[PDB]
């Protein structure tokens, strides 16, 4: 499977799991060329993405292979800060945006939430509509070494070492948000023990489990 | 794209996003002739609307081109009060009606809610089943210059300068209501800063963003 | 449209609007012969109902035209107490059952809830699994002259003067329950004024509005 | 109907009712050979299960008929402790996992919840990612003679005397969790009387009702 069809599959999986709110959905894949990234072109939604819809652009959004969503220009900043990351996803999914609107960080209280235990930062500042510089610097510093970040009053972003892991973390974060919001009906949520959480975090992020789960999602589109 | 197929597309987008509760859904488009508007004929739902289902009627609901939903007669009153508005949508969508049933105005707490920041009025009075005169005057005075209004114990109405902007505001209001209701689980909601909210309000209501998002929704029907 | 296809259409509308929880769904239509009713045969769900699946049975569940769901035997008791009623629906729909599980009567707080204003009784007693005699007598006395009743720890039942009105009330009750439950997030719900509620109750239950809305739902199946 | 197609049908019913969260879904059927069980092979989701996808494995996960999901190895432990049980289901369904994340046992407050009255244990300890020995022993001791168990911070498991009853209990538990969570909006939930609950528990778990409801679900896939 080439990276262009893996990118298109990830977009279908994101829409299949209900992670699209207009054209806010963004996905990128680190290009072999420095200061460049592969992303979805402007005006296209997640579930209508084909391999021929992802284009390579540079730091100035010059489509150097194959017009990209200009709100993805900040992706190069976090790519710069994290060489281990090859793919990024940022959407305004319903449950994750509700958590972000209430300024609520994730509370790891169930097994499927552990992939984000000690791996989901929280950026309390909502900068409005900043330039790619301010937005890119703000998220990079707040993301740190973590695999995901909840952006208050905004949504989330996932930083995966592959398109598969970024999609994996993206689907699990949104369902983690739904789970946390529903469990809130019984009052404040008690988190699980950190030692077991990290243990479950490591088991659920295994490349064999991540790869097989992604393949399962592909066959569903 | 002609206005008749844009009207039919808007109805499909409204039903696609779950904004129909029986035959309560109403949509209108200002006619070139004064004291006349284009609307959907009686008995038809949103997702079964075709370009040949929208008819022109006057102040007395006389179908002067192509029987209209008589509960849309009040649309001419707000058209009279706002010459900048060319399209109107009024539905009893599930999340917006729940917000209206609880007498709850919108609290702008997330980025996708900003299109309604300082642009969503609240009519606390529910007049029951008034004549088109009383209902038209009540909503016009309460709507003011705003792009939308929550009608307590009823639903909402959007006033757009085009069918595309009315549909745009309609979809974002309903998902704003869903977001606010879900975020309420954590207690009262803290709104975002007004200066950034207006800034995000202006960016998200850009005609290029509104037009592209509408096109994306059309390709989905 | 014959009554056999109207019964089958009502079942599809009930399943279309998500009102099935296993084989608990029951629908009946008063037969021309006394002490007899038309109902759906045992083992069939709502969305697989055809006109040839409704059979006439008597007080002893003897299929005298065309084996019926024996839990519908109590329908004859309420038919006896209300000669104006020709159709009955009883389901364990998700939102209405949640309201019944919490022993919560309907609070009319939105326009689409008015068809049940002063028309939805509440039976606080859950009798378990009673015989058709006890269950039939208990519901008849508690239903009174009302068009619907919430059965605590159970579900609801609608009593319509036609299959169309029973389906109409059934769909609006379930969405009334969903609306009330969601609006509860903001605290206790303030009901609308009774005078306007009865006025809206009378407008929304007009046979022309009920008939047109039913036709719209049929074209959707 | 052979047991291989009954197993495949159960998986489709589980996915039809929304009981899949990645590849966490597990189903097993006791084999005629001791210390062996029939389960779904690794990497496959519930709704893509065919009769030719279930394989027989022993205590060491050696596929002795037809590679199985190794997280199902603990199924043999509970099979050992309960000879009356022939089928087991363990999923991380959304509503049941939210209940488990909040450490909330089921409160029987509605008729369709009674199949689990005095039949749903609660394991407060979440062991993380234990070996099949620890996980198998922990669940067996906590399950006892009950037909289901809520696993805190995890999900649930159902122990049925057939694939049909395990699927039956599985679907009703998840909808019981959804019902309880939604009813929580009105405050703490008052449970029904135990005598009637056990009576309704016995009526709803009748093999004729369980078998007919399973057949209805099969015709829906
Ligand atoms: Ni964004
Ligand atoms: Ni209205
Ligand atoms: Ni019942
Ligand atoms: Ni598990």
Author numbering:
A (entry chain A), B (entry chain A), C (entry chain A), D (entry chain A): 28 to 93, 96 to 250
Would you copy out the relevant sentences from the publication that reported this structure?
The enzyme responsible for the core function of heterotrophic nitrification is pyruvic oxime dioxygenase (POD). POD is a non-heme, Fe(II)-dependent enzyme that catalyzes the dioxygenation of pyruvic oxime to produce pyruvate and nitrite. Bacteria of the genera Alcaligenes and Pseudomonas are known to perform heterotrophic nitrification, which produces nitrite from ammonia using pyruvate oxime (PO) as an intermediate metabolite. PODs have additional sequences at the N-terminus consisting of 20–30 amino acid residues that are not present in class II aldolases, corresponding to the disordered region of AfPOD in its crystal structure.
The structure of AfPOD and its homologous enzyme BWPOD were very similar to those of class II aldolases, whereas the zinc ion, which is the active center in other class II aldolases, was replaced by Fe(II) ion in the active state of AfPOD. Interestingly, a homology search using the KEGG genome database revealed that many class II aldolase genes with unknown functions shared extremely high sequence homology (E-value < e-60) with AfPOD. Molecular phylogenetic analysis has shown that these proteins form a monophyletic group that is distinct from other class II aldolases such as FucA, and recombinant experiments have confirmed their POD activity. Initially, we expected the flexibility of the region to cause disorder in the N-terminal sequence of AfPOD and BWPOD crystals, but the AlphaFold2 prediction gave an α-helix conformation in the sequence.
